[PDB]
């Protein structure tokens, strides 16, 4: 009957992609963000223990 008067409709909402929950940024140590606001390198230094002698 109607070949031309029956519409096809488009949803006004996009399907957002299902994507993985991001977890690692909160699990690692962040304490250098207080110093690292300024330069291109942070140097981290560690003790070498003094050696026990006989």
């Amino acid at each position: 009957a109607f070949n031309n008067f029956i519409p096809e409709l488009w949803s006004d909402m996009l399907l957002e992609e299902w994507t993985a929950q991001t977890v690692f940024a909160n699990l690692v140590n962040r304490e250098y963000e207080g110093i690292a606001s300024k330069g291109n390198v942070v140097h981290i230094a560690g003790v070498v223990a003094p050696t026990v002698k006989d």
């Binding site: 993985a20 929950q21 991001t22 977890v23 690692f24 940024a25 699990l27 690692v28 140590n29 962040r30 304490e31 250098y32 963000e33 690292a36 606001s37 942070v42 981290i44």
Partner: protein, 109 residues
């Protein structure tokens, strides 16, 4: 842990899918894994291996990360009647202590 690994903790043989061997029915009903052996268990699809088991075990102080700049900006295109959306993230990270991180299936991909 990746999803292939997290399935074993929720499978029929699991210590957690029984109110007898774990303390209560929460691991059977709600699917809760919870803490194991004092460690907090977390699950992710962002590990590199998606079809064999893979996990990392670590102490937080073993690895550092910093986000330095994180910004988003709107413009008009010069070549066309378009908006242009751009964003920049500047960051870095280091395993400061490598022995504080343990990797199962390291070569997994």
């Amino acid at each position: 842990v990746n999803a292939e690994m997290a399935f074993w903790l929720r499978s029929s043989g699991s210590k957690l899918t029984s109110a007898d061997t774990s303390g209560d029915a929460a691991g059977l009903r709600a699917g809760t894994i919870g803490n194991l052996l004092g460690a907090r268990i977390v699950e992710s699809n962002n590990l590199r291996d998606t079809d064999d088991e893979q996990f990392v075990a670590f102490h937080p102080s073993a690895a550092a990360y910093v986000s330095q700049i994180d910004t988003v900006e709107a413009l008009r295109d010069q070549d066309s009647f378009s908006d242009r959306i751009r964003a920049l993230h500047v960051y870095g990270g280091k395993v400061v202590r490598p022995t504080g991180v343990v990797v199962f299936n390291k070569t997994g991909s």
